[PDB]
Amino acid sequence: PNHPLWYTLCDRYGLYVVDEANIETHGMVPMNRLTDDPRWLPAMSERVTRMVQRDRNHPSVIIWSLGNESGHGANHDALYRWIKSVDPSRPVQYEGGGADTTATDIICPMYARVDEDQPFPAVPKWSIKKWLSLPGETRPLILCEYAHAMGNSLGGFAKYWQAFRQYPRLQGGFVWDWVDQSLIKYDENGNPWSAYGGDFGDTPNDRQFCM
Amino acid sequence: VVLQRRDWENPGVTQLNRLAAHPPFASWRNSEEARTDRPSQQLRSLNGEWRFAWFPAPEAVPESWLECDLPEADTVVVPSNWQMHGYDAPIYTNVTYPITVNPPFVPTENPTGCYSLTFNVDESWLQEGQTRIIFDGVNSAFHLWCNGRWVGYGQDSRLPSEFDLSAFLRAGENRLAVMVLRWSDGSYLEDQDMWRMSGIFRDVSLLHKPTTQISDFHVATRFNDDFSRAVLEAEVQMCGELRDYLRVTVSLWQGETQVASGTAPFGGEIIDERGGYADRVTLRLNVENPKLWSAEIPNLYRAVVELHTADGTLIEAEACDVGFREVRIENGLLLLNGKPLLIRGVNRHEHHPLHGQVMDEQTMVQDILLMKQNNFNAVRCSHYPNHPLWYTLCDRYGLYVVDEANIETHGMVPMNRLTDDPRWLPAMSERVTRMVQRDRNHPSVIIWSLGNESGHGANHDALYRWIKSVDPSRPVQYEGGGADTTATDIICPMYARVDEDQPFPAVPKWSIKKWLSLPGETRPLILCEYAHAMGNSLGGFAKYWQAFRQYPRLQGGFVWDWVDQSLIKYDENGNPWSAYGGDFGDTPNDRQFCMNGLVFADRTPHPALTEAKHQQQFFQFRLSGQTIEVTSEYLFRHSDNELLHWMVALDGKPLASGEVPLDVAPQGKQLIELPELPQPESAGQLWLTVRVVQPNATAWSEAGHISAWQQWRLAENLSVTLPAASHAIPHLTTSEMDFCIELGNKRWQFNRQSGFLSQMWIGDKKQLLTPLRDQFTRAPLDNDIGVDEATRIDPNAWVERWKAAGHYQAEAALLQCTADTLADAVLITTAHAWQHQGKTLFISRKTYRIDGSGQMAITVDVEVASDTPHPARIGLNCQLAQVAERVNWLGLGPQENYPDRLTAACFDRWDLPLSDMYTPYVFPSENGLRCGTRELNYGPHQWRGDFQFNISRYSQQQLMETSHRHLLHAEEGTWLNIDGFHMGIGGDDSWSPSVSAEFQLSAGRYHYQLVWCQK
Amino acid sequence: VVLQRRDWENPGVTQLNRLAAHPPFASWRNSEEARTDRPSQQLRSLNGEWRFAWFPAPEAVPESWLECDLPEADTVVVPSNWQMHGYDAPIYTNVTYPITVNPPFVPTENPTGCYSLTFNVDESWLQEGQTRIIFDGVNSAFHLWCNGRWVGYGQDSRLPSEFDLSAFLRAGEN
Ligand SMILES: CC(C)S[C@@H]1O[C@H](CO)[C@H](O)[C@H](O)[C@H]1O
Ligand SMILES: CC(C)S[C@@H]1O[C@H](CO)[C@H](O)[C@H](O)[C@H]1O
Ligand SMILES: [Mg+2]
Ligand SMILES: [Mg+2]
Ligand SMILES: [Mg+2]
Ligand code: NA
Ligand code: NA
Ligand code: NA
Ligand code: NA
Structure with a gap:
């Protein structure tokens, strides 16, 4: 969840908002190790519940998100239901565990391609055009992350928008992402330079991936 | 700190x-x-x-x-x-x-x-x-x-x-x-x-x-379409240092036979982007023609989970009983092994009268044995997870279990205040999640329950989904918030009635028949609580079972409840008595509301148990002329320990009996043709009785156990012969203050002031201690009382409607009292009015006819004002001087029975000790009644007609004035109540009028006739 | 006691004495102010110059800091990230946890930031009603004290933690 003023501005300037619970457990093995452990359900619920209690009156919030990259766990299903129950006015989405689980009203894959299947075991990233029409699938598809804007990038961006416009149930997505996460450091001359992972002696690091 | x-x-x-x-x-x-x-x-x-x-x-x-x-x-x-x-x-x-x-x-x-x-x-x-x-x-x-x-x-x-x-x-x-x-x-x-x-x-x-241990294991059984093939899936988790040499073996056993086995090293399938669970392994064991678990046949296997090294060294082993069974809801039916269940259930609290809420194996086995012997097949762990041994015994003896999370917030306002509060979700979740983690491997647990009486809050929906997510093998149910919320797979109302809507705002209790077909409704309906067994109750229990049998989606329910929650206290002598709420100085309290059991705290049956046994029978019967159609309501088992005894009796006297072995397929039928039955010369009504007897002992029953019965009227020959013209003619001694009838040493005294038979004499012995008087009231039952207290009067309860109308202090006022000498008899005509505040409640018109044979033919005709609440009974009472050891009657019995709880009783000649004619309800009320009686014998006395009666050392007055059974004292002589008519006892709940219209005495005009004589 | 419980290593405890979450409040005592979303006298910002000291672990925090400003401490702007003032390094890591994966435990060397503020509360605030403190964002967990007395504890870095201070405050300096 964001600084409170953010929603006020989005209400006033006019932006659709996905409000995301502060739950990401990416580093776990497997990703859902905590989110499937019921002992961690309390800690997870307060992050989902207290968000809803804070932000539920803001018009700009149109979708609730259960968090990010925490696989799919039973805890997600319980909290999915909790939100649907407490606030019917907004869809609930969550990408973890393969982007189309029972914890999401929206097929929300990250970096799934327009035409090309990436058929990973357990958690495939189907081509977005194919994904929609998989046996028994009815839901809308909006990419929670796509078009990784890392350095010289957005190659093939037009291909997404041709798909979005042609396919009713392809309803767009959220580019990743808005702003480079670089910090200001200073050299011997006192000149500011853009710094990334590893420039603060931080290690292990993931270098320029913050940009 | x-x-x-x-x-x-x-x-x-x-x-x-x-x-x-x-x-x-x-x-x-x-x-x-x-x-x-x-x-x-x-x-x-x-x-x-x-x-x-x-x-x-x-x-x-x-x-x-x-x-x-x-x-x-x-x-x-x-x-x-x-x-x-x-x-x-x-x-x-x-x-x-x-x-x-x-x-x-x-x-x-x-x-x-x-x-x-x-x-x-x-x-x-x-x-x-x-x-x-x-x-x-x-x-x-x-x-x-x-x-x-x-x-x-x-x-x-x-x-x-x-x-x-x-x-x-x-x-x-x-x-x-x-x-x-x-x-x-x-x-x-x-x-x-x-x-x-x-x-x-x-x-x-x-x-x-x-240190390297089995920390967790889950057992799953899935099946093909006809249950001829199974796959047992066992997931094993470990704690300790992971080593490549580590193995898990899951082997499955039927008795001493190893039916299957598999071994794998640790490392589960890929779960997501980060891989799989390295600290887990799942074993899949194919099982052909598995012996299915049900409550009918609790076929059990044993799974053994071996944590061991590859060189064969055992580290540790854990195990469990495995029942092969599938529980699913499909097309609105709860199915077990593809077959629609009929839940013959009961709620059971963990209660001992001595040790409180400590549970012991013996008590647990005693309950199970009693439940099964009385045709129960299911139990609800109201309202918390039980002692772990309980599930093991339900696994082994065969009972379907509803496991309930320890969550009840009844006292909150509104009821869901906490369960809708997201701050109470963690605490609630621990109670649900830890239940499922502990009990998920028990076959006998067929339904998960989210708790009891805590309204419906968002927390219920979250936990509902959690169980559905974590264990798809069992339906989830929860009654709170109206019994049909999004938190329940089953419509599980409490005390919803069969035909009568109770349209409470926000949370109506619809008639269970109506509920099923409410626009858009598709779920099965199993009452999580019904037929409140508080004191003299289970009136209208048959009405539920008629509906269960007729409606597919009506799949039964759980009686409330198994065992009276009385506690043992001791008096000044050191003698023990059954104690309830308030007997410990505890206040505020809810008195006897803790006592709603089918059995007493020591596990002594209440009269109601036999009614539950009869209605929950597994064989149904039809008579068509000479042919008996037997229908099995078993889903899985053949009748392989069943033979049918039949018996034709004429007014008690046996004429012909016999046995036919039962050979009925589950859900099938067997026709049984009765041998040409001999014609009886004498007058009377022939009664066929059938009993199903289990010849062989089981784990839950002794040999000769009666599992089912049924009765029919066969031929009736009405008496057309005039009794022989008697020689003696009785004499009327008309006095100022009395009418006296004399026949030999026999004397009848009719008081001319009151209008009643004040005394009867056989020689020098008096027969009555109190005159023979009309009675229109009863010692109020718990159902008559409700949640009515002196501190807060509920004017709608039967006892209060009656009290307010003056039924209990109504004084008899003589209107007519004449005598006549007939050709061969004396006739006493009387008329009485029972009045209160100028209102005539009941008028009783009577004739007494005493003839040469020494028979007193009493004819009673009663008027009941239409605007007075319908009376508890229309009868007569008196206190007999005699005290005999035996009571003998031709009618329904042997046990206590009331008009709306008499289906389990059988018409026959019964002989019981006087004590047995009294039911020791811990809170005293009307009790011991027997209906449809044509002849009652007590000492010298015989009464004939068509009436109901109870007989004891206890007056209605003493019963209604005494709070506990141990405070009761035998009065001098024997109190007799003979009713032409008796109001139902109700019990659909015990906090509002629950006696059905057809069992209320509403006719306005009532007629009955007795014959009194010495034999 | 705080040292002995170690609430930052227990997922069962995520808050102590924290008030219920709710939509944004200002507690206007005048309707027109509320209609126009103008500032509220009842909602004060405590942003600005706070006193701050850095410790390698919570064990290294002297007990004296509860009642006295530590002389070693610097004066810093709040809100801030103490990494941005240079007290320790920020860490950029994508997937791999910055700390050893051993739930629920954290490293014994746990960079502790000791923030303090001397501020004045008005008379009228304490005579009637309720005075709560709102921390809109604290990363990753914190114990609060007011005037030496312990108030509570809170987790979740991205949601406001609110605590009641009605009992804890005095008029003038706190
Ligand atoms: C490297 C992938 C396996 S994870 C990948 O890292 C990205 C780097 O910007 C983003 O954080 C994405 O959300 C994440 O899925
Ligand atoms: C008095 C009713 C409003 S509450 C009623 O009390 C009963 C008494 O045994 C049982 O506890 C029932 O479960 C409960 O619904
Ligand atoms: Mg209750
Ligand atoms: Mg506590
Ligand atoms: Mg903690
Ligand atoms: Na589109
Ligand atoms: Na990044
Ligand atoms: Na049925
Ligand atoms: Na009770």
């Missing part, structure tokens, strides 16, 4: 350093011991003699108690409830919380139980591996110290709390210190309608586990 935090007044702390929940462990170090479910050296009980001190609050606990035993502490048995030893009072309150409703705060005066144990610990336990202590039940919260150091803290009274003592114990002598608080924030979720007790009331034990 411990005093500073107050973890017992914080719903965000429910545990500190508590280990994970898991299914039953024993950490066997020998496979064969595991396979056979024999004792484990690694599971030590700490039950027995413990040290115990009591304090008014935790602040009054001396700091010394942690390191040194207190000399003032008495030695007591554990497990126990400390109220049962007398340290403070047990509180019975139904809905209203036993404490002040101020969450999360409990009283400052918080009764504290300071348990301590000095115990020996083997060195081999501490040199390697892990040693945990398991508290199966601590009510309601506790802190734990081992040798002076703090271990942890735990809540939820009805689930095992487990802590690791590995770093805490030393070899030789150790001391445990358990500080148990009576009230915690956990108490807010523990508001079940039962005795509020506390203490270490379930087993304490020590479990030793290797």
